[PDB]
Amino acid sequence: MHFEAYPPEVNSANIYAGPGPDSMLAAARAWRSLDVEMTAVQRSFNRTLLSLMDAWAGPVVMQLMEAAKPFVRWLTDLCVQLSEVERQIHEIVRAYEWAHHDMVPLAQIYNNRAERQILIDNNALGQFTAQIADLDQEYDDFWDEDGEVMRDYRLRVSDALSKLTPWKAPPPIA
């Protein structure tokens, strides 16, 4: 969406709160293990098939091979998809680290408003008015900046997720 719909306090506080990337990183690890195991699974399956093909090599076994072909393809594709997950999770964690880093620190915002208020209190003669306007422009710049950061964050995450395609149901062997 458009995150400039929200003030710097919201975008900054939002990106700075939360538990952090750890649970994602753990998930990445897990997805890697899966990627390994299932690859092994694939390799065993195709070995087993071959073994059968070697042991009998009759028309019946060839029929079985033809029957199991779509499941073999499916298992292969499954492994290909599995290999992507860790990659994309790390892309996402990266995107988060960069958003977290590029976002305007809350203290700079707070400081802006505080300085503005100090000028207001002292403005009885009106001579600080332009400076107050300047501080307002700086605040708007924080607004815009957080906007851009959240835009890029969204785009990166979106691009990463787009690469994780839907799991498909395995075909029957028959």
Window 92 to 121, contacts with other proteins (CB under 8 A): 92-93, 96, 99-100, 120
**CA distances (Å), 7 to each of 98, 108, 137, in order?**
20, 13, 13
Own/partner contacts of 46-54, CB < 8 Å, gap of 24 or more, are 46/72
Beta-carbon contacts of 35 under 8 Å, excluding residues fewer than 6 positions away, are 79, 82, 83, 85, 86
Interaction residues for other proteins, span 114-153 (CB under 8 A) = 120, 122-134, 136-137, 139-140, 143-144, 147-148, 150-151, 153
Under the binding rule (CB under 8 A), the answer on residue 66 touching other proteins is no
Q: DSSP alpha helices (H): ranges in the chain?
A: 8-16, 22-55, 59-102, 106-121, 129-162
> Judged by CB under 8 A, which of 65, 71, 72, 83 binds other proteins?
71
Could you give the CA distance from residue 114 to residue 123 in angstroms, rounded to a whole number? 14
In the bound state with other proteins, the residue whose beta carbon lies nearer, of 83 and 151, is: 151
The minimum distance between CB 16 and other proteins, in angstroms, equals: 7
Under the binding rule (CB under 8 A), the answer on residue 59 touching other proteins is no
The minimum distance between CB 95 and other proteins, in angstroms, equals: 8
Say how many residues touch other proteins, by CB under 8 A.
92
Under the binding rule (CB under 8 A), the answer on residue 11 touching other proteins is yes
